[PDB]
């Protein structure tokens, strides 16, 4: 149903753009249909881009459209910014079921509305059969930075608490189990969700936020390694304090997966001084998936425990020992 | 050589990002390696996104990297803005020759430097063999609008001159002939080039620019139809005044192609009041490919010639008659 014609730039192209994309994204900035969108924005801005390649396109709790909006809304938010405007670049396979496209577009429209964001400008490329697997989406986000200094990977400092906003491993498990035709529990679905509202309240009401990051590819373990490395410190984490749903733990062990390295799509790590930790945690409890928000550890200077060097992540194990959480070695198209 | 590992988000991923992308894009905004780039920008902004799917990746006069930078720099420029900052989202096929990637990355770095632009933030997804054809790139551009009112597709008005910045059909012909192993002449190559500097001088020194657009997919004929439609006017064009290189004309007729509908990648249309037309043309002559900048026609009100309705494009033919230039019906992955 998606003919090559829709990517040629002619009459059918313009029809798809007006009748589908504009209809769902509905705003007068996009409606302009010019070579660029005109934006009125305040000053220090945050900009992020991500392409989305998730297989399958549809899964419990989300889809590629939901990922395309939430993930980019989230990345902009990690710099302590208020996301305002997104662009979307579709890459589509000739022959694609058109209802797949409309469902994905509908998901994006809905997600953007819920996040208080508009899709202001776009692109649509249709490639011949076989040139791509159904559909990829790139989204780029632009937002207004809310604080100075703003959160940054290099700002974790000794004595900081490390907070998590909810359960680990859910998204990664659900796509990997979907892809093998397995449903472990009703309990197991993607956590794809927008975190801009929790971040705004953290940054403006709690304050002094050092680091925000979303544990997507590589999971909690490789975002903690990134932060430890950028901040030249060591992250100490308590295994029992990292929330992982029983059903996720059980699904992960059945598939030989580690929930600490599986991509999440509706979660953040928040690092900040100890005296603000309790207030931040109170806020995280009210954010998406916040039933399971928790203090999971702390930041320490090199040689403080120790022997762990700058950039290392050490987990105190449930058995009373330790495990070094190093970066991976995999798990394709989980987002 | 491009292993799946480079898309997993682990140690090799971070190595590729630092050792290749950051090396070539070299700037302290990107160097931050955070979830978003921090940008200091003035006020009314222009934002555009485009994905690039050109096949083949390398061709006379450019490549996908050159297209990825120039095309997006150009689109931002069409709103009478100064492009400042780009993002890039790579989608890569497992197994890809790594020197292909480095050559493309090198091209992007070079193009961005020449345009006076920085690549500030990025993404890199690697998909399994067969999930995509080698490589796609999305780029998003952000720029500062230079004038109010700024150029817009809906601002062409009766009496306006229609100017072209150079020859038509070159890019489209070269990729289509490359793809069939044909070299028509040394004269025939992509025109992939950045137009931001010509646009800045047009907007600030000539002034009162009504419309700017780049005749990419669908070519000159379907951007004139877009503008005529958005402006609810009729574009009148003179066939003999539209520049098309002899070698391009000859290559197009040998392949059954129409140079007026073939994508260009280093060209713009400029529409503005008659009394500024000569000054604008003087500027266009000094811009990229400006040897062939020309007045090609004019904008007229409905019923002014006529009988052509709002949105129509009529070409006075070289033989002394007329041809309606309507939108297409194709030519895949020409960009
Ligand atoms: N998937 C989409 N979602 C939202 N808007 C879109 C989408 N695709 C295209 N558009 C909008 O449609 C208009 C035409 O876009 P188009 O991609 O044809 O312009 P262009 O980038 O100048 O041309 P080309 O991609 O052929 O070089 C633009 O205003 C663009 O923002
Ligand atoms: N192709 C690229 N060009 C320039 N910078 C890049 C590129 N790929 C990644 N980066 C940069 O590397 C850093 C890490 O990017 P990454 O994509 O891993 O972060 P993320 O988007 O938060 O995670 P994910 O894509 O796994 O959800 C970011 O600062 C990003 O701007
Ligand atoms: Mg486009
Ligand atoms: Mg992130
Ligand atoms: Mg990314
Ligand atoms: Mg354009």
Automatic annotation (TrEMBL), chains A, B:
Pfam family, one: AIRS_C
Cross-referenced NCBIfam families: hypE
Family designation: Belongs to the HypE family.
Domain PurM-like C-terminal: 157-304
Annotated TM spans: none
Gene responsible for this protein: hypE
GO molecular function: ATP binding; metal ion binding
Residues reported to bind Mg(2+) 2: 50, 123
Name of the protein this chain belongs to: Hydrogenase expression/formation protein HypE
GO biological process: protein maturation
Binding site for Mg(2+) 1: 35, 75, 214
Domain PurM-like N-terminal: start-end pairs: 35-145
Matching InterPro entries: HypE, PurM-like_C_dom, PurM-like_C_sf, PurM-like_N, PurM-like_N_sf
Keywords: ATP-binding, Metal-binding, Nucleotide-binding
Entry binding sites for ATP: 34, 121-125, 216-217
PANTHER family associated with the record: CARBAMOYL DEHYDRATASE HYPE, HYDROGENASE ISOENZYMES FORMATION PROTEIN HYPE
């Amino acid at each position: 149903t998606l003919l090559l014609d829709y990517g040629s730039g002619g009459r059918a192209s313009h029809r798809l753009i007006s009748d589908l994309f504009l209809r769902h994204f509905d705003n007068p900035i996009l409606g302009t249909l010019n070579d660029a969108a005109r934006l009125d924005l305040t000053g220090p801005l945050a900009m992020s881009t991500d392409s989305y390649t998730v297989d399958p396109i549809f899964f419990p709790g989300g889809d590629i459209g939901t990922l395309a909006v939430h993930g980019t809304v989230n990345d902009v938010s990690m710099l302590g910014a208020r996301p305002r405007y997104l662009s979307c670049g579709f890459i589509l396979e000739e022959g694609l079921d058109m209802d797949i496209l409309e469902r994905v577009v509908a998901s994006m429209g809905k997600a953007a509305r819920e996040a208080g964001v508009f899709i202001v400008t776009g692109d649509t490329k249709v490639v011949p059969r076989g040139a791509c697997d159904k559909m990829f989406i790139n989204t780029t986000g632009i937002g207004e930075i809310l604080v100075d200094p703003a959160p940054s990977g290099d700002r974790a400092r000794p004595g900081d608490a490390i907070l998590i906003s909810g359960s680990m491993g859910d998204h990664g498990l659900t796509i990997l189990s979907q892809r093998q035709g397995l449903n472990f529990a009703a309990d197991v679905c993607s956590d794809s969700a927008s975190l801009n509202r929790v971040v705004e309240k953290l940054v403006l009401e709690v304050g002094d936020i050092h680091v925000l990051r979303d544990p997507t590819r590589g999971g909690l373990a490789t975002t903690l390694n990134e932060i430890a490395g950028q901040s030249q410190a060591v992250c100490h984490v308590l295994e029992t304090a990292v929330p992982v749903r029983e059903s996720v733990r059980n699904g992960c062990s059945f598939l030989g997966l580690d929930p600490l390295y599986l991509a999440n799509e509706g979660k953040l790590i928040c690092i900040l001084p100890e005296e603000r930790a309790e207030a931040a945690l109170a806020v995280l409890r009210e954010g998406p998936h916040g039933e399971h928000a928790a203090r999971i550890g702390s930041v320490k200077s090199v040689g403080e425990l120790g022997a762990a060097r700058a950039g290392q992540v050490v987990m105190e194990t449930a058995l009373g020992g330790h495990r070094l959480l190093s970066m991976l070695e995999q798990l394709p198209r989980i987002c």
